[PDB]
Design a protein around this ligand. Structure first.
Ligand code: PIF
Length: 376
């Protein structure tokens, strides 16, 4: 049904430019350092946000569990699951979405409706919302990435929210710190360290803490997680252990059970940017839905598509042209002293949340009646 391959394979490696680019900007803000298209992968930060739903069935399961603590356990696993994918794409760069660029994924498969918009470019900020009968997932993310002499630090900012449709739950949790070791080189690998605190704003009963342990590459502790579900009193009720890229278990003492396991990677995934089966389907465009998409949707972005098709020269041409276009548009917008307003997200306190207009206007080819910004 869905594609399980790409028109052209990913290149051996073309990270020669990365050496000088990163050594010349130690300590500087990388979102301001333009980089060749050859370093990118066919997905952008909006689609990367969509991948956090690969294991969305965890929420489907928590949607019918009446105990709040078990619901907490499964949602914690879901929060950790958002990291599995990064293990194989150890060092990989997503496309930087254009201001106003949008991305959608209608999956009748997992019963969810996902959409997102790049609400800001200076600094880059991605916002997303996914709706389902069994949950509502939404978040706002921005970065503070920097390259120090031999390693890259990815610092995400913005919390993630999930709501369940029959219990009234509102889960809110923070992103953790990531490090890419040996980017310039050796064995390039990604590490995730820090503490995730998951709170249920609606249910006082419990809270959860998941620690992502940092260690030496060859250690039996690398990729480990130590989590606990605490009652209001502050007493440990359920332990969580395992490795964020293989399996997650609950229990710890008397008993134990595996609550989550990474999906097997496609046979020969190494030849396709080490994408997961899920990631392979995000940029595919299906003849019927093409008419329902808005022209700002990423599958339309020409440089990214040429990249999938293995056309490096024409991909680079399109990228620089899109950059010049974006600059001239922010130019015209600021010569009139008018701030930019995104189309599907309004700014509540500091976050970017859905303004309830995407799906509604998508109804019955409704996008065809209006007209959108031309980003390419
Ligand atoms: C990895 C986690 C994802 C975090 C990334 C999220 C933020 C992000 O896309 O910033 C991009 C940087 C490199 O910009 P790049 O792709 O050339 O995007 C261009 C630049 O932002 C450029 O300054 C801008 O010009 P303008 O300002 O004139 O408008 C253009 O509009 C953009 O096209 O890349 C990086 O952040 C470096 C990450 C390298 C990944 C690891 C490699 C192995």
């Amino acid at each position: 049904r869905r594609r399980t391959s790409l028109p052209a394979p990913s290149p051996s490696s073309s990270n020669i430019s990365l050496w000088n680019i990163l050594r010349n900007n130690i300590g500087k803000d990388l979102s301001k350092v333009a980089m060749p298209v050859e370093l990118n992968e066919p997905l952008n930060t909006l689609q990367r946000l969509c991948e956090e739903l690969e294991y969305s069935e965890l929420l489907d399961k928590a949607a019918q569990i009446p105990s709040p603590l078990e619901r907490m356990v499964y949602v914690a696993a879901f929060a950790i699951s958002a990291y599995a994918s990064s293990y194989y794409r150890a060092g990989s760069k997503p496309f930087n979405p254009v201001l106003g660029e949008t991305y959608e994924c209608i999956r009748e498969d997992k019963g969810f409706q996902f959409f997102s918009e790049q609400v800001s470019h200076h600094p880059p900020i991605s916002a997303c919302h996914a709706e389902s009968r069994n949950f509502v997932f939404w978040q706002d993310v921005r970065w503070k990435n920097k390259f120090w002499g031999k390693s890259m630090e990815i610092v995400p900012i913005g919390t993630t929210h999930v709501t369940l449709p029959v219990f009234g739950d509102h889960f809110e949790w923070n992103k953790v710190t990531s490090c890419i070791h040996n980017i310039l080189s050796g064995q390039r690998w990604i590490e995730h360290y820090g503490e995730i605190v998951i709170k249920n704003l609606h249910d006082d009963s419990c809270y959860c803490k998941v620690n992502f342990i940092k260690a030496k590459y060859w250690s039996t502790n690398a990729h480990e997680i130590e989590g606990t579900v605490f009652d209001r009193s502050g007493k440990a009720v359920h332990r969580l252990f395992g490795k964020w890229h293989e399996s997650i278990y609950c229990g710890g003492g008397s008993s134990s059970a595996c609550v989550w396991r990474a999906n097997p990677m496609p046979k020969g995934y190494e030849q396709y940017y080490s994408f997961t089966q899920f990631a392979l389907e995000l940029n595919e465009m299906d003849p019927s839905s093409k008419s329902l998409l808005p022209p700002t949707d990423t599958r339309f972005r020409p440089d990214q598509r040429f990249l999938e098709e293995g056309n490096l020269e024409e991909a680079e041409i399109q990228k620089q042209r899109i950059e010049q276009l974006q600059r001239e548009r922010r130019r015209v917008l600021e010569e009139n002293h008018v701030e930019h307003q995104p189309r599907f997200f309004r700014k509540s306190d500091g976050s970017w949340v859905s303004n309830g207009t995407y799906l509604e206007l998508r109804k019955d080819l409704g996008f065809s009646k209006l007209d959108h910004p031309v980003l390419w």
